Curated annotation (Swiss-Prot), chain A:
Locations listed in the record: Nucleus
Effect of R70Q: Reduces affinity for substrate about 5-fold and reduces catalytic rate 67-fold
InterPro entries reported for this sequence: Nudix_hydrolase, NUDIX_hydrolase-like_dom_sf, NUDIX_hydrolase_CS, NUDIX_hydrolase_dom
Binding site residues for substrate: W15, W33, E34, R38, R70, L84, D119
Protein name from the UniProt record: ADP-sugar pyrophosphatase
Amino acid sequence: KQYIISEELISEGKWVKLEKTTYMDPTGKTRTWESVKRTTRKQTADGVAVIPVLQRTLHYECIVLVKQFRPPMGGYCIEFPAGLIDDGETPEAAALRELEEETGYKGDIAECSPAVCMDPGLSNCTIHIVTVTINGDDAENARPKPKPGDGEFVEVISLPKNDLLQRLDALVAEEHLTVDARVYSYALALKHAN
Amino acid sequence: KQYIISEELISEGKWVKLEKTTYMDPTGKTRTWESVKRTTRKEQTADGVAVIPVLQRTLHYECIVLVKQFRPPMGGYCIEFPAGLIDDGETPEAAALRELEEETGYKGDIAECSPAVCMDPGLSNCTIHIVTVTINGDDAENARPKPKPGDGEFVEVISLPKNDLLQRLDALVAEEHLTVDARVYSYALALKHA
Ligand SMILES: c1nc(N2CCC2)c2nc[nH]c2n1
Ligand SMILES: c1nc(N2CCC2)c2nc[nH]c2n1
Ligand SMILES: [Cl-]
Ligand SMILES: [Mg+2]
Ligand SMILES: [Mg+2]
Ligand SMILES: [Mg+2]
Ligand SMILES: [Mg+2]
């Protein structure tokens, strides 16, 4: 019933562009929307985000998150490890690569989502959510070395899975960080389960 | 360590703007970023709300109430938590309850309200509160709920059992071209992982 008629370029940067989208509303009336897109899409999606389950015997299972300065937010955010998918890279490979560069951990793929949208009222941006386990008892994950690319500066924060929502709430209250909505949604569901 | 030095307007729409952000990196070097923001944020603690609406009814499994709508930035249909922007002077809770009623017809009761969480912090400053609301589906008000769409709003309600949400979403994606929202998928994955 609804569909895109045309897209008008408004402004194109190196990384991001803004378009004016014309679309048919379901009454047969023509309407416009201000839409954001990345200029980098090739890929199944723009990016990947990794849900990294750190498994160490005799410890609680942890979810590994990252903290970085985010210029659009003007502050520090707590997020799943994540990055854009390289041209000709599979989402699974992007997931292990980004996880290693951002955290130093070497993980194994558990499952991979379909492309999912980030903020569909605003942008066309999509990601694959890739669940990865990390065997924290393996020697390669003993002293995990983060490999920050040029212009990346990432702190690693591992939080127990069974208390994740309360641990995040505490970080927000004391550290004045912004938690990512996907991470928050994951944490809420861990509490809402059963 | 890191902070914003300047924000230069590149292009300003009715709803969305694009900025060149200058910031200080942690080595002490000046760098730039292309940043998206909405034009509609005033004194609100966030741009919008998304609602996690848990439909509860005697002798029924709990359901998660979702909405399906055409999203012009995506060029197609998306499955999302009910959501909208917070009106000026409106609380996030009030906005949640109001958007849930407008989009679904249901009258919920507040359960919890998140701090402001970021939508896509490598791209935009956009933030929401995630508001958990229970719906008493035994109450007569919630028997035959009718959405009250705004001008240009055309929303379908999809209620899925919490106990099988991820599979039910996968089955929806298998049957039509539609995209699931990343917060919905994250919530569904944690329900499985718990
Ligand atoms: C048109 N209307 C929008 N509104 C949000 C409430 C109506 C919008 N948001 C991002 N781009 C947009 N273009
Ligand atoms: C600068 N660099 C960006 N990226 C480095 C990897 C994507 C970017 N993304 C949105 N805006 C941006 N401005
Ligand atoms: Cl898992
Ligand atoms: Mg990253
Ligand atoms: Mg990177
Ligand atoms: Mg809405
Ligand atoms: Mg609405």
